Amino acid sequence: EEQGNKLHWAALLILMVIIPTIGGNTLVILAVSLEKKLQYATNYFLMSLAVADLLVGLFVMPIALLTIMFEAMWPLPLVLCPAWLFLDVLFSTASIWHLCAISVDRYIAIKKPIQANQYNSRATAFIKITVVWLISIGIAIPVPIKGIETVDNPNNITCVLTKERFGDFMLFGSLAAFFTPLAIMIVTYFLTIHALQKKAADLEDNWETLNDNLKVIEKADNAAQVKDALTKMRAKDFRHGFDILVGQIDDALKLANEGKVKEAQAAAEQLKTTRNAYIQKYLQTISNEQRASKVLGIVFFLFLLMWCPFFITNITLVLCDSCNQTTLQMLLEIFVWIGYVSSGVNPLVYTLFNKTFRDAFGRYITCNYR
Ligand SMILES: CN1C[C@H](C(=O)N[C@]2(C)O[C@@]3(O)[C@@H]4CCCN4C(=O)[C@H](Cc4ccccc4)N3C2=O)C=C2c3cccc4[nH]cc(c34)C[C@H]21
Ligand SMILES: CC(C)CCC[C@@H](C)[C@H]1CC[C@H]2[C@@H]3CC=C4C[C@@H](O)CC[C@]4(C)[C@H]3CC[C@]12C
Ligand SMILES: CCCCCCCC/C=C\CCCCCCCC(=O)OC[C@H](O)CO
Ligand SMILES: CCCCCCCC/C=C\CCCCCCCC(=O)O
What we know:
GO terms for molecular function: G protein-coupled serotonin receptor activity; G-protein alpha-subunit binding; Gq/11-coupled serotonin receptor activity; GTPase activator activity; neurotransmitter receptor activity; serotonin binding; serotonin receptor activity. The protein is built from 13 helices and no strands. It has helices spanning 7-34, 42-69, 80-111, 118-140, 142-146, 163-218, 223-231, 237-258, 261-305, 308-319, 325-344, 346-351, 355-365. It is elongated.
């Protein structure tokens, strides 16, 4: 009885994990770098996430792949062991916290439509990116500092974190790298649902007010009613609609003061084609916001879902004393790769819902770059 040979698994992983990861993230980086249209603040998150996922595919996965074909033994120099473990925890944690930063960033966009200057957005973006990387470095730093337990005649050292030396880090590190942002994203999810629901209402409320007052105006016999039902209505591109409407209200009110109801009611008629222009525009944005938020929700949920097996089994392998550790480890060795896949192809799947990105990709796969 023997372990056997796992060459076919290695081949499989090279085919359906590493290549997808590298190719996908490369495409995203190329897209953002080449396309002028795509060079705005919020896409710099994506580029930062892409690099993180790209580096996992270049430096982390192939070593993880080596360790699979040479047992617990560590063929590389010992010094590269804590380094590989550092980069692994670093990049993996970064990809998760990146999605949390995007989630919250997108919520604030919906809630606070104003204050969206690109000039500020770029700086603010960079700051956020840097914070995410700082949080990642923070979470990953215990590994190299603690070091690995160290030889007789040869070196029989296995490159792995032990439950005796890193049980806490595994527990609190898991809490820090996965469950915290998960909670944050859940809260953000519900805040976003509430935000949109709230947004939809106020619009219908103002529609109602306008319609009601216009109804009052169009049936008015005297001037007092017209003048009365006009002040109630009086309550860069954003302020333009305000100036226009308020201007028209004042124009009609100026006629109402004159006592020319026939003129005012006619001026009020023009307000219909005016409200229909801004209500139909404002009511259109929330639709896109809703569709977008739904897509991001599903996609991000799938990402989070594919990481559960690892961190849950991780904490269980630490806490559960009665559980069979052999099977738990055997499971972990798979769940690690399921996680690698998750983070590996995430940015691509996400950006594939954008026509610009998607077209760019289509042009890049045929090797045009023009
Ligand atoms: C994907 N990556 C995997 C990586 C890892 O397990 N690397 C080793 C080398 O591989 C193991 O899984 C092997 C395979 C099967 C048996 N193994 C183990 O038992 C122990 C896990 C363990 C240690 C102590 C106690 C319980 C379990 N392994 C290891 O140390 C650690 C990560 C991590 C740990 C803590 C916080 C984190 N945030 C992000 C991450 C991360 C990224 C995340
Ligand atoms: C695993 C080892 C043996 C080989 C792995 C090589 C990988 C990195 C190769 C295989 C297929 C290659 C991709 C094939 C096609 C494209 C589209 C092109 O417009 C830019 C690069 C890109 C995205 C390549 C990036 C590198 C790539 C993903
Ligand atoms: C084993 C020791 C660990 C390291 C082993 C590495 C093995 C990687 C194998 C193939 C490299 C292929 C290189 C492909 C790099 C693509 C980067 C790319 O071109 O994207 C940059 C961007 O497009 C520009 O703006
Ligand atoms: C994009 C499609 C995703 C590709 C699927 C890749 C998922 C990886 C699956 C399992 C890898 C197994 C590696 C561990 C070796 C032992 C395998 C075993 O005993 O079953």
